[PDB]
Design a protein around this ligand. Sequence first.
Ligand SMILES: NC(=O)c1ccc[n+]([C@@H]2O[C@H](COP(=O)([O-])OP(=O)(O)OC[C@H]3O[C@@H](n4cnc5c(N)ncnc54)[C@H](OP(=O)(O)O)[C@@H]3O)[C@@H](O)[C@H]2O)c1
Ligand SMILES: Nc1ncnc2c1ncn2[C@@H]1O[C@H](COP(=O)(O)OP(=O)(O)O)[C@@H](O)[C@H]1OP(=O)(O)O
Ligand SMILES: [Fe+3]
Lengths: 378, 378
Amino acid sequence: MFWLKTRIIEGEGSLSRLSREVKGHERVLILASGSMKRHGFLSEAEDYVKEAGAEVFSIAGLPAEPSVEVIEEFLPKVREFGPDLLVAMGGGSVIDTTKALKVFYDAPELNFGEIAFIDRFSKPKPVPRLKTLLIAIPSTSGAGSEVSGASVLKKGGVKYNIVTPEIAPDVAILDPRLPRTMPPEVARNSGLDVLVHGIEAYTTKVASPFSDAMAIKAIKTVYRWLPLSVKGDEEARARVHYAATMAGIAFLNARLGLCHAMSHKAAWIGPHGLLNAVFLPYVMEFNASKSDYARRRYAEIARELGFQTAKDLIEVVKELNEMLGVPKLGELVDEETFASKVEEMAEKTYHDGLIAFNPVEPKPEEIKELYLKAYRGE
Amino acid sequence: MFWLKTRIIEGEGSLSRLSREVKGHERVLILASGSMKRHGFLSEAEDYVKEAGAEVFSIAGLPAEPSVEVIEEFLPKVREFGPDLLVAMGGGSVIDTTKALKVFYDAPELNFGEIAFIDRFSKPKPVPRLKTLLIAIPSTSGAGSEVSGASVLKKGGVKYNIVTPEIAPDVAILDPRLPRTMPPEVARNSGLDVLVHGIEAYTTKVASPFSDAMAIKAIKTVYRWLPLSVKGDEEARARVHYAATMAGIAFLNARLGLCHAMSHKAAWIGPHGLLNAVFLPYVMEFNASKSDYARRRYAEIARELGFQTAKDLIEVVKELNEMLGVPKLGELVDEETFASKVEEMAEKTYHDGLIAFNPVEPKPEEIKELYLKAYRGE
Ligand SMILES: NC(=O)c1ccc[n+]([C@@H]2O[C@H](COP(=O)([O-])OP(=O)(O)OC[C@H]3O[C@@H](n4cnc5c(N)ncnc54)[C@H](OP(=O)(O)O)[C@@H]3O)[C@@H](O)[C@H]2O)c1
Ligand SMILES: Nc1ncnc2c1ncn2[C@@H]1O[C@H](COP(=O)(O)OP(=O)(O)O)[C@@H](O)[C@H]1OP(=O)(O)O
Ligand SMILES: [Fe+3]
C-alpha cells in the first residue's frame, strides 16, 4: 500500500506559487510561527494572497507543543473570520496545530474524545469528510508533518493522536529560504529527526519497495549533507529540506517503531529529535540482536552508505552524534530524577500503538533496561 | 513539483483486492489481454467482482501496440454495457486503450486530433473533468502506464500522446503472479523499457529529488534482477514488477526525453521496449557530448551501480543489451525502407513534445544522424 494525497511544490522561491494556489478563494487564514514574522516571510506570503485577490488574516507566534487549550483561544476568532483555505507556515507544531484546527473548524459537532487514539487498545470513531483546503509550508527540516495525515495534541497534559487522510495537507510548499533561517541547534535536532524517521521507516513490518525508495534517499542525503547544513551551507540546507519530506512520505506509509515511542515518553527531558538520536543506537542494538529481519535491513542501509554490516551502521550513527556534539543522556537529567520516572516510562511505551510496527515486540522490562543502558552511556 | 494520484496496492495475490475496491459499484467492465484469459487470471478477476455483488462483463484479446481505430470498434461496446467502473488487465497497450476509452465514454464531444499532442507548437484542446473510476492491473513489467496520465495511440504507424491527470488510474494493483507468465522476450522488452524510463527520467530538465528516488531504485533493481527474470526466476519477476511502477512514478513527474520521442516515431519497426533499448546507448553518447549536466547525472547513476563515469554506464548498457540478445537495428528493417523514411522520422521526432525535456535540444539533422548511427550498429 502506497499513496500520497499531498501535492509537493519544491524549489528556490517556491513560496511565490502561493499566488496560483489561492486563486478561486475568498478568505485565507495563515497560522505562522514567530520566526516567520520576524524574518519577513509572513509579509511576503500575505502579499501573494492579496496578489490573488483574496482576504488574508494572520495569527503569528503560536507556541510549541500543540494543545487543545491553546487551540481553544483562537478557535472563536477563526470562526468569526470564516476562512475557506488554511495555510500553515512554520515547524511541525504549527502544521500539526493547523491540522487539528481544520477538524474542529470543519466538524464542530465532533467530540475530541471520540476521535483520538491514546493507546493501542483505543478504537476511535473515524473522521467524516472535511472540506477546507490545507496548504503546508515547513520552515524546519524537519518533522515530515507536511505530508502526513497524523497530528499530535495535548489535552490536560495527556498526549493524543489524531489520524485521518482528511487532515493530510492538500499542498506542501518546500522553499529552502525558510529553513536557512534555522539556528544551528534547530538545524541539527530536526536533521537527526529525519535520519531516525528514515531508519525506522525502513525497518518496520509494513515497509514497501515504494516507501523504501524514499527512506534510503533521505538517509543518504542527511548523512552526506547535515554536518555542512548545521554549519550554514546554503546548498546543504536545501538538500536536507527535501530529504525531510522524503522521509515524511516514507513513514506516512511504513509508520515508525520503538525509538519514536520511547522518545515520545521521554519528551519532558528535552527535544524530540535530540532524544531520538540519543536512543537510536541502543534501539538498533536491541533490534539487531533479537531480529534477523532488522539485522538484514540495517545491513542494507550500511551498504548504501558504503559500509558493510549492521554493526557498521550503529557505529556510523554513534560517530555522527559525536561529530554534531549530541549530548550524553546524563548531561540533560540527573540520575534520581531519571530513575524515578523510568519505571513509568517503560510502562506506557508498552501501551504505544507504534510497537506493533517495530520488528520486535518488547516486553515492559526490556524497554526499561534500554532507557537505562542509554543513561549509562553504554 | 511531485504528485501521485494513483493509490498503489502491491503484493502476492493482491488481485484478491479487486473485491474491496469495487464494493459500491454496480456494472464493472473488464478489458483484458488474451493471455490473461488463457492463464485463468481473468476468471479469477470476475469471481472477485461478482463476490462484491456487481455485474461484470469482460472483453478480452485487446491488441498490442493499439492504433486509434482500436477506439472506434470497442467504444460502441462500452456504451452498450454502461459501466461505472473500468478495469484494465493486461500490459501497457491494454491499459492505454482503457484510458482512451474513458475519455470518449465520459466526454463524448471530443476527438483524438483535438486533444492529442501532435505538434509541440500547436497546443491542443484541454480535457474536462471525467467521472468514471479506473483500476489498472499491469501484467507486464512494464510500461508504467498504471500510474501515468498518458495514453499512446498509433495514427499511421506513429505514436502520439493524450495527456491529462483525469486518465491517471485511481488504483494500481501489482500482483507478481501475473507477470510470471510473460514469455522471456516480453519480459526482456518490457524490462528494458523500465531501465530506459529510469535513465531518461533521471536526466530530464525537470528531474526533482523526489522522482530521482524512484528512478534510481528502479534502475538498480532492474540491472541486478532482469537477467534472472528473463530466465524465469520467480523472485526476480516480483522485484522487477514493483520497479516498473517506480519508474512510472518517476516519469509521471520528471517526464521522458529523446530516446522515447525517437522510439515513438519509429514505432512501425518493432516493439516499443526493444527500440528504446536499441537507441538508448546512442542517445546517451549524444547527450554526454553536448551536456555537462547529462555527463554528471550519468556518472551519478554509474556510481550507484558501482562504476565511475558516464562512459562506464554507456558500456554497461551496451553489454546488457548483448547479454539479453537484443538484436541490432539492421536486423529489423531493410536499408532502403529505412533510408527512405529517416528524414520524415527525424522531422516528426523534432516536433514531439518530449524533446523539450531532453537535456539538449537536437536539430532535425542531428536526429537523422542518430537514427543512422543506430542503423550502422556502431
Ligand atoms: N502511458 C505510458 O506511460 C507508456 C509509457 C511507455 C510505453 N507505453 C505504451 O505501452 C505499450 C507497451 O506495452 P507492454 O510493454 O506493457 O506490453 P504490451 O504491448 O501491453 O503487450 C505485449 C505482449 O505481451 C503479452 N503479454 C502481456 N502480459 C503477459 C503475461 N502475463 N503472460 C504472457 N503474455 C503476456 C501480450 O500477449 P496477448 O496480447 O496475447 O495477451 C502482448 O502481445 C506500448 O504500446 C507503449 O506505447 C505507455
Ligand atoms: N526558520 C526558522 N528560523 C528560526 N527559528 C525557527 C525557524 N523555524 C522554526 N524555528 C524555531 O524552532 C522551534 C522548533 O519548532 P517546532 O517545535 O515546530 O519544530 P519541529 O519542526 O521539529 O516540530 C520553534 O520554537 C521556532 O521558534 P518560533 O516559533 O518562535 O519561530
Ligand atoms: Fe517506455
